[PDB]
């Protein structure tokens, strides 16, 4: 069947876009890794690199 | 985990020395047991 989407509808029958992100962790190596970073090239002083 | 290497030189294999360098970034699960060479011709088959 088809949806009768109209502007006069309320809030329960109006069009709602829904996305689902499902994460997969197979034994295969991971290729999608989230971001990271900071920024000091400190010199003449022993720091943790 | 993939692996491929290459190097190019101006000379059969000579008696000189040179080292091959890793070339891509391809981590894919394959029980690779095949190898195929692909040539080029102009007969247009």
Curated annotation (Swiss-Prot), chain B:
Glycosylation sites: 31
Effect of residue 11 to V: In strain: Omicron/BA.2.75
Result of changing residue 12 to G: In strain: Beta/B.1.351
Function: Attaches the virion to the cell membrane by interacting with host receptor, initiating the infection. The major receptor is host ACE2. When S2/S2' has been cleaved, binding to the receptor triggers direct fusion at the cell membrane. When S2/S2' has not been cleaved, binding to the receptor results in internalization of the virus by endocytosis using host TFRC and GRM2 and leading to fusion of the virion membrane with the host endosomal membrane. Alternatively, may use NRP1/NRP2 and integrin as entry receptors.
Subunit structure: Binds to host ACE2. RBD also interacts with the N-linked glycan on 'Asn-90' of ACE2. Cleavage of S generates a polybasic C-terminal sequence on S1 that binds to host Neuropilin-1 (NRP1) and Neuropilin-2 (NRP2) receptors. Interacts with host integrin alpha-5/beta-1 (ITGA5:ITGB1) and with ACE2 in complex with integrin alpha-5/beta-1 (ITGA5:ITGB1). May interact via cytoplasmic c-terminus with M protein. May interact (via N-terminus) with host bilirubin and biliverdin, thereby preventing antibody binding to the SARS-CoV-2 spike NTD via an allosteric mechanism.
Name used for this protein in its record: Spike protein S1
Species per Swiss-Prot/TrEMBL record: Severe acute respiratory syndrome coronavirus 2 (2019-nCoV)
Residues of the whole record sequence present: 200 to 248 of 1273
């Amino acid at each position: 069947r088809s949806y009768g989407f109209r502007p006069t509808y309320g809030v329960g029958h109006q069009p709602y876009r829904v996305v689902v992100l499902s994460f997969e962790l197979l034994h295969a190596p991971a290729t999608v890794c989230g971001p990271k970073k900071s920024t000091n090239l400190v010199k003449n002083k022993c720091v943790n690199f | 985990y993939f692996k491929i290497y290459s190097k190019h030189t101006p000379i059969d294999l000579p008696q000189g020395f040179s080292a091959l360098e890793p070339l891509v970034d391809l981590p894919i699960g394959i029980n690779i047991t095949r190898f195929q060479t692909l040539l080029a011709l102009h007969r247009s088959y």
